[PDB]
Design a protein around this ligand. Structure first.
Ligand SMILES: O=C(O)c1ccccc1CCn1c(-c2cccc(OCCN3CCOCC3)c2)n[nH]c1=S
Ligand SMILES: [Zn+2]
Ligand SMILES: [Zn+2]
Ligand SMILES: [Zn+2]
Length: 233
């Protein structure tokens, strides 16, 4: 609760946690590219007496700090992590997680793409997500493959107990009014994929983008608007 952490509050290589609801936090880290600093969010979901992590904190150093920060602020073991797509902001740091005894998971689609890209590859495979609209339970969350959007493999994560939808990088914060990196995106399918998310999680109360400030379900329509504008450039 209180003010959501921004790059302001986060020195290079450090991580802040933010409690969204009982037993649900986001993690916020920063990375430089092209002379600008960007924030990046992931999720932490309490799983009985242990923790499920969604996404790395974008690199080995940040990910080591994330674990130290969890160890300091929450004090429960991270037993499993899921990466929501193959790019380095989601899997960069997987080796760090693995060395700390976290079981790292991604879909076969993400694992294959990470391999092709020369990125870190989560060890464990998540079955049953290969077709658009597929959902699978994973402890205290549901994993959902809405179809291609920011990437062909992107997953979204819902915490049914707290009504928290984590859209990852397929969903943009309201402040982002122009598309980010779309090299790997399927612009043609992105709005349909968003429509699947909307139809599957109409009860979501909190929506967390890959980057920047949380909001509500309006972030889905906002993303659609931004992607369509880019499509029509
Ligand atoms: O492109 C975006 O949507 C975006 C929005 C806000 C802040 C940062 C980004 C890009 C972050 N990113 C990256 C990324 C960005 C920089 C470097 C990198 O690895 C090289 C991977 N892959 N997928 C995503 S999303
Ligand atoms: Zn990406
Ligand atoms: Zn294992
Ligand atoms: Zn991202």
């Amino acid at each position: 609760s209180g003010e959501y952490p921004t790059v302001s509050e986060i020195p290079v290589g450090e991580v802040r946690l933010y409690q969204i609801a009982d037993g649900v936090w986001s993690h916020i880290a920063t990375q430089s590219f092209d002379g600008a600093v960007y924030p990046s969010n992931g999720l932490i979901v309490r799983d009985g007496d242990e923790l499920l992590l969604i996404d790395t904190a974008w690199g080995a150093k940040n990910t080591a700090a994330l674990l130290a920060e969890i160890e300091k602020q929450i004090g429960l073991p991270v037993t499993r992590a899921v990466s929501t797509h193959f790019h380095d902001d989601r899997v960069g740091g997987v080796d760090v997680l693995r060395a700390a005894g976290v079981a790292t998971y991604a879909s076969p689609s993400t694992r294959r793409l990470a391999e092709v890209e020369g990125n870190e590859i989560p060890t464990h495979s998540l079955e049953g997500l290969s077709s658009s609209g597929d959902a699978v339970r994973f402890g205290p969350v549901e994993l959902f493959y809405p179809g291609a959007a920011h990437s062909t493999d992107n997953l979204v994560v819902y915490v049914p107990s707290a009504s928290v939808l984590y859209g990852g990088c397929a969903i943009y914060e309201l402040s982002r009014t122009s598309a980010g990196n779309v090299a790997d995106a399927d612009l043609a399918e992105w709005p349909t994929s968003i429509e699947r998310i909307q139809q599957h999680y109409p009860e979501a109360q909190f929506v967390i983008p890959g980057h920047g400030l949380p909001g509500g379900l309006d972030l889905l329509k906002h993303t659609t608007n931004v992607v369509k504008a880019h499509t029509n450039r």
